[PDB]
Structure formats: structure tokens, C-alpha cells
């Protein structure tokens, strides 16, 4: 018998992104070569199969710093982190290969899917 | 130049609710008289002006237990916590006054608004 507020999920996500912008309650630093990204573990887990596996591990759930594979592109990671917090993916000709490789590593299936479709359209 | 995944915000919220159901990364217990509710501080802050004020406070942000006012109804709080994590509000004739009073206390303006409209329709 529930009623539903249509905009609630997007309002929550917008407020989580505002917390991230203000560095409020951020609890992990993701390191991607020379770059560092502060984030909330729960948002990362909710968006990525890799982070879900990492933060449900009984030892890794306690870490405040996670180092990604050195082959991961920081700009690709930055674009995906923004997508996690906003539903918007800044996909461009100059970044699509790095975004797709990063989404494959992070296990973000819907992003891998749109990248594959955009690449197929150019060939 | 971004593209947007329509279902992303609702998928994130669904995954945050799955973490709550499995007690994964929950970092606060909200006590409402004799009842206890485990939750994620960031989701509570994103949904409630009261929790935003509490967890942005330099002392209270560190607390693992928050006690609400003894006048707050636990069922009303439970209904609102479910709404935070799902966008669905289980509003019924038998709970509407408690839900509205709890939403006023938690500073959840859209919920207070729908409660006021449902009460006005019955008079």
C-alpha cells in the first residue's frame, strides 16, 4: 500500500555527491598511480562489483586506502567516480578506451555496455 | 557532453538498502525508546535535515549511537527509515499522525507535505 516519491533516489545521490564535494564522512582514499580520490565506501560498493568484493572482505573492509592496478588510467577512474555519484558519464572519443578498460576492471557492466555500443558505431 | 543512465540512482539506492539488510558497513545505531535501528550515516544525512545537522557536527559525527527524543514513535521512525532507503512510504490511516510528527522532527519536508495533503483530504 506504499506511495513513492519519484525524485527521491536522484535527490539522495545528489546529496551524497554534495557530501563528497565537501569531504563529509568520506572514509576511503582510492589511489590510481599518482592520483588520490576520496570517496564513501558504500557508494563505491553500490556501483562496482570490484568494490563490492573489496569492502565485503573481512580484512579489506577495514582499509582506509585502496591502491588500484598501475595500468588503470586516473582520468578514466575520475570519470567513473563522477558517474557513480551523478548517473552522468563524460564519454568522449579521447577517453572511451580508458573508460571502458576501467569499467571492465571495476565490474561496472552497464558502462562497459554503452562503451561497446559507442565503439561499434564508429567502426 | 555527458550521457546519463536513467536507472542509476534507483539502482544505487536499492544496493544501499541491500547493504543495510545484510548489515554491511552500517556505522550508526539509532535508538528510539526500546528499539534500535542500524543504518549508514551518509544515507541518513542525505535524507534528513536533522541527521545532516547531527553528522556534520564535529563531536556528534564520531558517535556510533544516536538517541532520539522519547516522544518519537519507533514504528513512525521505521517507516521513515524504509522510505529513506527505498523511496516508498507506507502511509496508513493508523500511522499517518506518527509518520508526520517523526518527519517534522527529522526535517523531511516532502514527507511532511504528503502527510499534510492526506490529512486535509480526510477532513
Amino acid at each position: 500500500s506504499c506511495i513513492q516519491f519519484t525524485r527521491h533516489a536522484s535527490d539522495v545521490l545528489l546529496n551524497l555527491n554534495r557530501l563528497r564535494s565537501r569531504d563529509i564522512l568520506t572514509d576511503v582514499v582510492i589511489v590510481v598511480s599518482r592520483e588520490q580520490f576520496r570517496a564513501h565506501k558504500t557508494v563505491l560498493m553500490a556501483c562496482s562489483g570490484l568494490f563490492y568484493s573489496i569492502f565485503t572482505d573481512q580484512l579489506k573492509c577495514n582499509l582506509s586506502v585502496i591502491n588500484l592496478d598501475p595500468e588503470i588510467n586516473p582520468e578514466g577512474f575520475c570519470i567513473l567516480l563522477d558517474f557513480m555519484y551523478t548517473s552522468r558519464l563524460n564519454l568522449r572519443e579521447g577517453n572511451i578506451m580508458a573508460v571502458m578498460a576501467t569499467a571492465m576492471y571495476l565490474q561496472m557492466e552497464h558502462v562497459v555496455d554503452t562503451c561497446r555500443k559507442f565503439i561499434k558505431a564508429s567502426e | 557532453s555527458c550521457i546519463q543512465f536513467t536507472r542509476h540512482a534507483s539502482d544505487v539506492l536499492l544496493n544501499l538498502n541491500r547493504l543495510r539488510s545484510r548489515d554491511i558497513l552500517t556505522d550508526v545505531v539509532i535508538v528510539v525508546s526500546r528499539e534500535q535501528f542500524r543504518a549508514h550515516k551518509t544515507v541518513l544525512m542525505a535524507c534528513s535535515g536533522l541527521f545532516y545537522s547531527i553528522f556534520t557536527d564535529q563531536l556528534k559525527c564520531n558517535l556510533s549511537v544516536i538517541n532520539l527524543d522519547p516522544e518519537i514513535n519507533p514504528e513512525g521512525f521505521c517507516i521513515l527509515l524504509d522510505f529513506m532507503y527505498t523511496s516508498r512510504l507506507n502511509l496508513r490511516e493508523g500511522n499517518i499522525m506518527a509518520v508526520m510528527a517523526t518527519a517534522m522532527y527529522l526535517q523531511m519536508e516532502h514527507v511532511v507535505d504528503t502527510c499534510r495533503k492526506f490529512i486535509k483530504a480526510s477532513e
Binding site: 506504499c2 506511495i3 513513492q4 516519491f5 519519484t6 525524485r7 | 516508498r88 512510504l89 516532502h110 504528503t114
Partner: peptide, 5 residues
């Protein structure tokens, strides 16, 4: 907003 889901 509010709707019947």
C-alpha cells in the same frame, strides 16, 4: 511528486 508505484 508522489505516485502509486
Amino acid at each position: 511528486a508522489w505516485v502509486i508505484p
